[PDB]
């Protein structure tokens, strides 16, 4: 049963509002299909919205449908919270991972370190889906 982690970045209020919008979007996706909407870790925004959330998805082929859903999401939208009434290009990541002595722990971490360096070396291909 896979976990999905939604994180807000670079924005004080604009990103947290977008992270909360993306939080509700994935929960309604799980509710419609027939998956468990259990939340393990949650943190609300400093002003308004959500800073970070970790939602567990349980059922049949959980990671199989949420495999391509992984990546940074772009939102090109006006802010209702900004006084100036400005247009904002804000980002939120949606890292999805499936569910799983000191020498073995370090070797597992070093294999993980090399894996993340390979994913990041591609470029800004993490920006997978744009919202306007």
């Amino acid at each position: 049963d896979c976990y999905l982690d939604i994180q807000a970045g670079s924005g004080g209020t604009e990103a947290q509002d977008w992270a909360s919008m993306l939080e509700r979007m994935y929960l309604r996706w799980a509710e419609s299909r027939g998956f468990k909407t259990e939340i393990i870790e949650e943190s609300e925004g400093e002003v308004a919205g959500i800073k970070s959330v970790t939602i567990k998805i349980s059922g049949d082929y959980a990671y199989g449908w949420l495999r391509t859903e992984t990546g940074v999401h772009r939102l090109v939208r006006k802010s209702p919270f900004d006084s100036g009434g400005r247009r904002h290009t804000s980002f939120s990541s949606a890292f999805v991972y499936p569910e799983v002595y000191e020498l073995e722990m370090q070797k597992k971490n070093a294999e993980k370190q090399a894996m993340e360096d390979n994913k990041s070396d591609i470029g800004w291909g993490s920006q997978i889906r744009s919202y306007v």
């Binding site: 982690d5 994180q7 970045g9 670079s10 924005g11 604009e14 990103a15 992984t70 990546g71 940074v72 006084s83 100036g84 009434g85 400005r86 247009r87 904002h88 290009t89 804000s90 980002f91 939120s92 990541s93 949606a94 890292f95 971490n109 993980k112 370190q113 993340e116 360096d117 994913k119 990041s120 070396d121 470029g123 800004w124 993490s126 920006q127």
Partner: protein, 47 residues
């Protein structure tokens, strides 16, 4: 094609690390006829 990460050595999450660097910035749009709108010299200048 590569990108020099301001993190450096990424350990836990790559997608979440790039999310917190100036590549995925909070981009501000210079809106006209509002707050932070004034242009002393225009796009084409006065005729």
């Amino acid at each position: 094609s590569r990108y020099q990460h301001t993190k450096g050595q990424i350990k836990d999450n790559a997608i979440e690390a790039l999310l917190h660097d100036p590549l995925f910035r909070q981009r501000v749009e210079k809106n006209k006829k509002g707050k932070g709108s004034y242009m002393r010299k225009g796009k084409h200048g006065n005729r």
